[PDB]
Design a protein around this ligand. Structure first.
Ligand SMILES: Nc1ncnc2c1ncn2[C@@H]1O[C@H](COP(=O)(O)OP(=O)(O)OP(=O)(O)O)[C@@H](O)[C@H]1O
Ligand SMILES: Nc1ncnc2c1ncn2[C@@H]1O[C@H](COP(=O)(O)OP(=O)(O)OP(=O)(O)O)[C@@H](O)[C@H]1O
Ligand SMILES: O=c1ccn([C@H]2O[C@@H](COP(=O)(O)OP(=O)(O)OP(=O)(O)O)[C@@H](O)[C@H]2O)c(=O)[nH]1
Ligand SMILES: O=c1ccn([C@H]2O[C@@H](COP(=O)(O)OP(=O)(O)OP(=O)(O)O)[C@@H](O)[C@H]2O)c(=O)[nH]1
Ligand SMILES: O=c1ccn([C@H]2O[C@@H](COP(=O)(O)OP(=O)(O)OP(=O)(O)O)[C@@H](O)[C@H]2O)c(=O)[nH]1
Ligand SMILES: O=c1ccn([C@H]2O[C@@H](COP(=O)(O)OP(=O)(O)OP(=O)(O)O)[C@@H](O)[C@H]2O)c(=O)[nH]1
Ligand SMILES: [Mg+2]
Ligand SMILES: [Mg+2]
Ligand SMILES: [Mg+2]
Ligand SMILES: [Mg+2]
Lengths: 559, 372, 372, 559
């Protein structure tokens, strides 16, 4: 087992998550089996309790774990499945040793942060890195650890102490440290004192960096490389840079151009790892596929515009799996994507009195779009604006996908306007008044990977053809509210077909509307099962439908 | 336990619906037909009682001709096709009846030979036993010529690989039990990258433990890769078929869009010593069926021929290797052609008659016989 | 089927003839004694019916204490030796009764554990199963600590050697079946030149197939010779014990007139990573019993330690290697000492608890436990 | 009224009768009132004329109808009473329309197979399914129709044509089709072309299957399900399998595990049928009782052996109600049953010359048994062998039950050997010689449900205690011969007490012998009144007596 810590810097926004995911995928090009662990200094047990306004969305695993967003970067670059154990936190590990001290496994000893908590962290990392995470039976060859927060924040102290010990409690040449660090530019001169201070803060904790990975708005000067490589122990080829490029898929090839594998191939002795003839082929094949999708982003120009309608769209981190799911679906179509970020509340007619500027801009953006997405996220702000987007998309025949809350919004819209029930509404917020036209109801969560069964007549639907006309689908759920199953037959008779349901019925999971080119919704989040070469099927439907060629996509999928 | 007839009554109607009228009905069943099962079909269909044939689920497919002859099936076609009106010469009737006596003998030998030779067949998808039917029949012809019963041990080549010992430790130990058990080893061909290190491990085991080995098509290239990795000590030498995205210099295979059908192999001039050239009667040339796009790198051939892995035969042009035999092993051989396809019941495929004699012992007496 | 008593009546007379008078008669028989068999002995001898003990031919020798306790044998000696007159403290009675409950548990675990781990033991004269009794008992203690049943597969090391495939082909195939079958491998020690290439072949197989290996005394030197012959590629490197009439330069063993009894091993400074040093609780030193005249050539040690065969522990003086673990294998270990002799029923020998956990899986959970 | 046709396949031996009975009982677990109809393509009016060597025994209804054996499967799984009208045949319905055309109800029209015979079949099914068949007053909610023979046999043509019309002459969602079909396995691969051809033969007649029920020696592969569900209109959950398990009582729970109710609950809209609070309780209670008796067959091991002595025992279908009556009686005792099939003729001393092997085996089997049954069935073969079994059972004190001919055989045995009348015999076959020691006499049949009155002194008998010490019993008769009532007082004085008789006397119906643990006979067939939870009392006596605990059984029955 090899370990690669990706760590620290001078700021919390530095973009470690891209570099960790990219470093792991580059190791996967050698054919190595790879896994990864995110460490969070926060005291929350999970990202589930904490609101999307901080650290972006929670990400859902097959376990039903509501983990930190960074686990999604690993799953979509590395192709692996992660467990709720792969997101370590301060909350998890203090809860673990405190529950263990009350149970008494420490034999009446005094329990202390060193050695007992730092040995508990090292036991967690040793257990969790040996969980098999590919579909194959094998234990991973390499583990990427991403150390969240910044080095020398008091929040991090047990993890920087544990990782010092770990560099010896596992062999050297089985452990290596990448430090990620800020190189700000002032008056056009590339200033280095922030990264020199961060390299000292690592040495103060006994962590010694094997590569320094600069984050900068420029190519590093050869003087900027030398002034760091002379201050730190790293050689000139071990001062990595990652530029402020928009395409995060280019980062693996920007690291490969900087010869970063050729250092880790020595520094971790990756030639001593045994590999089969299948492994080297499936490794090199994966690199050629990534050269092709990045070539397609360099030379595809013909924009498809998708409008994304939701709360707090200024927090673009709040929708990162949607963004990445749309980008995978646009690459599969060989088309460039624009996302138009529509703050759903500004669509509402009250905005035309309160701030007439925001009203006209938000309705410009929505009218402009070749297809529409309503992305999910609980909370009562802007839902009539999201209902207005679903209405516009139904009436103007514009491709629509509704994910989680977006499906319920389309059901409420179709009830208010096509069934003509003018006060039909979500149970989430009006039930203090005990309303009879319930569109949502409660059914304390439904979470993680679940089976959807396609209902027997559904063979016609564009969405069931996108799932290869298979009878069942596996996707990740997260909801407490679902469509009222008393009203379902009214919608299924008026043409809004609930194409798929849970095994028990009375719990709707996919709809497609008869008489529209692509108007679809899902109760699950299709984003989380997206992979770079195999996009999320409902999103491959939406981004093909917006472009045209949805028939040719379905004809392809029938091979 | 009751022999149900409605499926065959429906199939006889489906023939009449197309205007095809059956002259014999040939039942396939797990039993002898009851005389009631014959009558209930012969009363429904136009066929007489002697025109309801049965063929039983016997293992020996060579017994079927004599099970049809016991059911008097020739004596119907001799009338129904008027085969007495066909003119035949005195040579024809002799070479006809002689052929029947030879078939009575080989079937008698399968009834009364008991002393098993075990051959391990190492390959992809061995659960699909139809995937290797000419290998199976070539081994059975070679075992009958030796007057010995055959077991084939079906080794899924991937399960030999050390990753299996982590993934499913049961399949690892069983596949290595089967390979260790065998009196001789065959690597059968078939393109595709699954299990090739497992096939390399079988070639290694057979070279080192001195156990008879035959490599057919991919099996020859696997033995060349094995001998390169382990006896020449080139640790990353490999097939061009799958690593060439990385442009590797130690090419064991190369491309040379197919080479197909019957072709001449010429034995290279020094090759008179080899058990394989003695099995081909010490004739200078051999005719066998090819099927490949990849062949041994002819730049590396002199290294193998100096280290003792002699490419005993090549194409007329050279630079295209077709038979090897290794100096210093009782029978370690490979072919680029498929020797299976030229096997016949009375005249088995020579490389396979070599393998199944070598496993049994008596390879010298086989070669002494062939010299007559 | 009748339980004959005249041999024991004659043995009871032979005791009286020397003036020795038996207080209990302990029968050894293939059955429960009949109550007539007890009475016919208790009437001939001075012993009462409860002083005619039996011990049955059960396989589990750990059941014998509870079979004697069921026959109330303590309740006789508690009178006949007046053991109530011996003074005992309150700690003594607790540590006494605690020990009985621990033995009830390990015997309960042998009654209800079913999930076999197979260890192959490779050596000279394995038909003499008494020749390896501390190995056998050390493996049984290590399997009980894992809550798993043990099979030992007794592989006569010489039969693995390729000369056996000519001399007696039956013994060749059976010995290689047994070795291929096993979840882990032990090379047990014992001087003498018979079968050592067969033991080298078992060490090779275990290294290459990634199968757990423990080499004890000669078994460590065999693994060093194997790693030298095949991974360093020194084809004639060998034991000084038997070739030194030819004065060979590639010495793997050398003489260093014995080293005997309990000695200290010091773990070398970098060794914290090793499964074997974790099994010894990450303590800096180990106390174990030595018996050898030959040891690893300390001139060649840095070559092995650079190629990944780490001599994890040495004598206080250095130049005398005592534990190795190989980088890049789940559990490939050897010891110069005999770890068997320090095994105890509740506290198994650490290298053997490593081997029998490694074969089963759960070696991490064993090491996590030992860290408490 | 709902209809469920169970139909067809590729072969006549396929086991529709178990699947029809099991499907009906599963519908009864919902609390629905259920009924069923067997259709036979044969030209016999009844199974009474036709010999037991074909289609097994005739089954007797309360009407005295000698119906097809399959009606017994329905009565014993569903708990219902069937009338002679519930077995439809070609003979019945052509006799009906031909007698109706000669009477002239068709008003001088030309009468044709379509529409007149197919409308007569549809009128029969509509009349007969509305006959009340539970003990309660209600008309059935659901009817199971079992279509006998195979589809596209010319024998079946009027019934496959009638059932096409019936799918419309009754509403869809009030009719559904189960097709039962053969999935043979060759070289371990599950071949599907026979069932694809049978699904085409249904479509050729316009019958469209709602479920395909495979009969196979294996679990279906998921590929075997998909390759059928892709060829036919049925969804993956509508490809049912029934495995070659020995316990036919497990089939209801194997269908329930395959979620077959959850399809029919939609496809027949069984939630629209009104049900009372008693109905749902007595429905769910019935399911728990069936879970218990099947659990008892999984975990009862302590075998009771019963020897069954009769003609043609190689035809095990000839004794199916005996077999099922013994299995109900062994389950009530919580004991596993072996039946030992003794061909009665092989017991006879002539066999020891003719084939000495068959002699020794048949006497081994009879000597081995914990109890003995002589099962009935007319015909002169083997009767001295059956007399020898009755002798052995009387003399060795081994439990004996004689049913119909088996009672007369025990009377002949007791006369030949205990009264010592060496030539006393059946009137059935010697009366060409006009013998005075008549044991049987003729008394043209006595058929159907009749009253037995217990004779006044009979309170002591194990058999009258098994009938709860009630004064009268209701059971199904079928005989032309009975005990000579002139000789009855000789037997009643020598200890062979005729415990019960017909209301008129001179017609004996139950005997029990004084001075044996359980030696009993019946003139009626007790098999036909057996039910899964309430076994036939004479058989519950026999199988308790063989096991021991006959006193505790009688003590229980006194509650
Ligand atoms: N080299 C980079 N190139 C482009 N964008 C980057 C880069 N580094 C960081 N970012 C961007 O900055 C944001 C944060 O990056 P990332 O998630 O990798 O940082 P992080 O250290 O893991 O932050 P956090 O601790 O909150 O998870 C993301 O929008 C990411 O795409
Ligand atoms: N699924 C099954 N499991 C076990 N036994 C079965 C099954 N299907 C059929 N059989 C057995 O095969 C025989 C015939 O079955 P069944 O009576 O149900 O078939 P059928 O189609 O009604 O035949 P028939 O038309 O003659 O009445 C019986 O012995 C029955 O127990
Ligand atoms: O204003 C002043 C006065 C004095 N100094 C003095 O401090 C010294 C250290 O030099 P700097 O502090 O400029 O550091 P640096 O250029 O090495 O590092 P970067 O942060 O640019 O990467 C010398 O340059 C000396 O003149 C200043 O740096 N600034
Ligand atoms: O369940 C029933 C009811 C009725 N029938 C009726 O159909 C008839 C045709 O008889 P079969 O259908 O049994 O056909 P078969 O025996 O001739 O053919 P195999 O498939 O066994 O070769 C008669 O036997 C009649 O009773 C059944 O076959 N099965
Ligand atoms: O063949 C003979 C003849 C005579 N005897 C005679 O010797 C006597 C002593 O009897 P046993 O010699 O049989 O001795 P035992 O049964 O007491 O002892 P076990 O060895 O069975 O424990 C008597 O039995 C008497 O008949 C034999 O024992 N065997
Ligand atoms: O011997 C031959 C030659 C040709 N074919 C050809 O017929 C085709 C149809 O395929 P099959 O006839 O094998 O049918 P199937 O596998 O779909 O159905 P099952 O009966 O196994 O359920 C193709 O497989 C084609 O090669 C055969 O099937 N058999
Ligand atoms: Mg912040
Ligand atoms: Mg991050
Ligand atoms: Mg029949
Ligand atoms: Mg039936």
């Amino acid at each position: 087992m090899k370990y690669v810590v990706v760590s620290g810097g001078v700021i919390s926004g530095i973009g470690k998550g891209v570099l960790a995911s990219s470093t792991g995928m580059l190791l996967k090009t050698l054919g190595l089996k790879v896994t990864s662990i995110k460490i969070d200094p926060y005291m929350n047990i999970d990202a589930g309790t904490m609101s999307p306004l901080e650290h972006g969305e929670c990400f859902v695993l097959d376990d039903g774990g509501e983990t930190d967003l960074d686990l999604g970067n690993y799953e979509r670059y590395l192709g692996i499945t992660l467990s709720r154990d792969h997101n370590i936190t301060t909350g998890k590990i203090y809860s673990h040793v405190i529950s263990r001290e009350r149970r008494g496994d420490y034999l009446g000893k005094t329990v202390q942060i060193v050695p007992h908590l730092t040995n508990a962290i090292q036991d967690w990392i040793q257990r969790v890195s040996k969980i098999p995470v590919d579909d194959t039976g094998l234990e991973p060859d390499v583990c990427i650890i991403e150390l969240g927060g910044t080095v020398g924040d008091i929040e991090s102290a047990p993890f920087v102490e544990a990782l010092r010990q770990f560099q010896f409690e596992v062999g050297r040449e089985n452990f290596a440290l990448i430090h990620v660090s800020l190189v700000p530019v002032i008056h056009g001169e590339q200033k280095t004192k922030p990264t020199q201070a961060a390299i000292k803060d690592l040495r103060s904790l006994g962590l010694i960096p094997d590569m320094i990975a600069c984050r900068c708005s420029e190519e590093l000067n050869r003087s900027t490389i030398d002034k760091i490589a002379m201050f730190c122990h790293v050689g000139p080829e071990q001062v990595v840079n990652v530029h402020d490029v928009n395409s995060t898929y280019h980062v693996p090839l920007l690291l490969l151009k900087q010869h970063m594998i050729d250092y880790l191939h020595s520094r971790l002795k990756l030639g001593e790892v045994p590999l089969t003839l299948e492994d080297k082929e499936r490794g090199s094949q994966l690199l050629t596929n990534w050269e092709n999708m990045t070539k397609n982003l360099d030379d595809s120009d013909d924009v498809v515009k998708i409008a994304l309608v939701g709360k707090y769209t200024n927090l673009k981190d709040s929708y990162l799996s949607v963004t990445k799911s749309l980008e995978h679906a646009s690459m599969k179509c060989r088309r460039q994507l624009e996302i138009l970020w529509v703050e759903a509340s500004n669509l509402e007619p009250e905005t035309q009195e309160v701030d007439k500027n925001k009203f006209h801009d938000s309705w410009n953006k929505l009218s402009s779009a070749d297809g529409i997405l309503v992305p999910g996220g609980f909370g009562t702000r802007g839902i009539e604006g999201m209902i207005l987007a679903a209405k516009w998309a139904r009436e103007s025949g514009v491709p629509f996908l509704g994910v989680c809350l977006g499906l319920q919004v389309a059901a409420i819209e179709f009830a208010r306007n096509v069934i003509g029930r003018p006060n039909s509404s979500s149970t989430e917020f009006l039930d203090e008044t005990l309303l009879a036209p319930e569109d949502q109801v409660v059914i304390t969560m439904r979470l993680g990977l679940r089976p959807t069964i396609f209902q027997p007549n559904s063979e016609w639907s564009n969405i069931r053809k996108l799932y290869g006309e298979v009878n069942e689908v596996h996707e990740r759920h997260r909801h407490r509210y679902e469509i009222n199953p008393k009203i379902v037959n009214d919608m299924e008779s008026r043409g809004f077909i609930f194409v798929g349901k849970d095994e028990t019925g009375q719990r709707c999971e996919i709809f497609e509307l008869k008489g529209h080119p692509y108007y679809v919704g899902t109760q699950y989040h299709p984003e989380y099962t997206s992979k770079v070469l195999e996009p999320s099927r409902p999103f491959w439907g939406l981004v093909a439908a917006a472009s045209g060629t949805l028939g040719e996509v379905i004809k392809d999928i029938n091979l």
